[PDB]
Amino acid sequence: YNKYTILQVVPALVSGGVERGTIEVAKYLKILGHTPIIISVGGTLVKELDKEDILHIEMNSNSKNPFVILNNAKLIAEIIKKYNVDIVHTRSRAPAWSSYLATKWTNAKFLTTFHGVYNIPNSFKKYYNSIMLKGKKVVAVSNFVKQHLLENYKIDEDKIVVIERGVNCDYFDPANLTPEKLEKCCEKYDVPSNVPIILMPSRMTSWKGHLVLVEALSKLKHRDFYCLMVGDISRHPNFTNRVKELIANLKLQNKIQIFGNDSDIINLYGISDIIISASIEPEAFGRTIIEGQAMKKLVIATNIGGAVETINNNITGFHVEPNNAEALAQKIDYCFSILGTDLAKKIQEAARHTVINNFSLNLMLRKNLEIYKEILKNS
Ligand SMILES: [Cl-]
Ligand SMILES: [Cl-]
Ligand SMILES: [Cl-]
Ligand SMILES: [Cl-]
Secondary structure (H helix, E strand, C coil), rough: CCEEEEEEECCCCCCHHHHHHHHHHHHHHHCCCCCCEEEECCCHHHHHHHHHHCCCECCCCCCCCCHHHHHHHHHHHHHHHHCCCCCCEEEECCCCCHHHHHHHCCCCCCEEEECCEEEEEEEHHHHHHCCCHCCCCEEEECCCHHHHHEEEEEEHHHHHEEECCCEECCCCHHHHCCHHHHHHHHHHHHCCCCCCCCEEEECCHHHHCHHHHHHHHHHHCCCCCCCEEEEECCHHHHHHHHHHHHHCCCCCCCCCEEEECCCHHHHHHHCCCEEECCCCCCCCCCCHHHHHHHHCCEEEEECCHHHHHCCCCCEEEEECCCCCHHHHHHHHHHHHCCCCCHHHHHHHHHHHHHHHHEHHHHHHHHHHHHHHHHHCCCC
C-alpha cells in the first residue's frame, strides 16, 4: 500500500539533537499510520519512547569487535525480516557498520543523517562514497554539514539532501505565555523589574563562549541589565566554577547569574529580550537561535558553523564575529538602544515569520517523509 516501516538506529553519542529528531519523526510516522521502530542502547531515551508508545529494541553497539558487528548485523537483519522494514535510518557518528550490513543482505534501504561534523579516514573516503553509498542518499542537518560532506568526505552532491532542523512552533509560541507563568519565572530566577533580560541558553562548556560574553558584559557595566545563563552545569563542572569566578572578580555577580537546566525554557524566553549564542567553535546548527527567533526575540549569534544559517543579518537577527568581546558588547549595546522601537518589533515579527516559513518542526518532519518516499520509489 502506502504505509512504511522505518527502523531508526540511535547511538550513545547524541550531540546535535539526535534523540529529539528521532522521537519527533517516530511520533509523526505513527500519526500517518506508518510503523516506527527504534533500536537504541537504552538509557533515558526509552522513557519517552514508552510514553509515546513506540516500539523500541535495546541493543548494545560495539564498533570495535568484528564478531559483534557481524552478530548485531544478523540481529538487525532478523528484525528487518520480522517487521518487513522498508528503510533503516542511521544517525551514527562513524559509518553504521552493523546496520549497513543488515540492509546489504535484505531488501531494506539505507539512509544516513549527519547531525554534525565528524571526520573519517582519508583512505576510506573513496570506498565510502563509491561503494557503500552507491544508489543511496544522505541527509545533512544544515548546509554547513553538507559542505563538510562535499569538501571533506568528497561525497557526490546529488546524494546529499539538506533537511534543516525545525522548532516546534506550537510549543515555542508567544501566544501561550500567560502573565502569571511569566511572573512565576521572574520570581524563580531573581529577575529585576525594569531592566533588559539577556538569556544565554547554552550548556556550560568552554567552547560555548560564556567567558566571551562575560568579558563583553563587563564592557557594558554602565548599562543596567540582567543576564541569565541557563544550561547543564554537570558534564563540565570545573568550567562552571571558572565562569562564576570571572563574574565575581569583575564584580558582576548582580548582573549575571548561572542556573541549572531549565525545565520549561519557554517562560525563560518570554521573560527575555535578547538571546545569545556565543560559541567560538562551530555548531552544526544553532538550536537556541531558531528557538529564540520562534519566540519573537532579538537574537545575537556568532557567525560560525550552522549557527548563523537561520539569521538574515539585521533583518531576523544579528551576526557577530566569534571570540570577539568588543564586537559582541557593541551588538548587545545596539539592541538595548532599539529595544521597544518599531524596528525591534519589525525584526522580532520577522524572526518568528521566518521560522514558521522555513524552520518549523512541521517542515522538517515532512522533508523526512519525502526522502523516505524517494528512497522507496519503484517498489
Ligand atoms: Cl531529522
Ligand atoms: Cl539548520
Ligand atoms: Cl512546528
Ligand atoms: Cl564534550
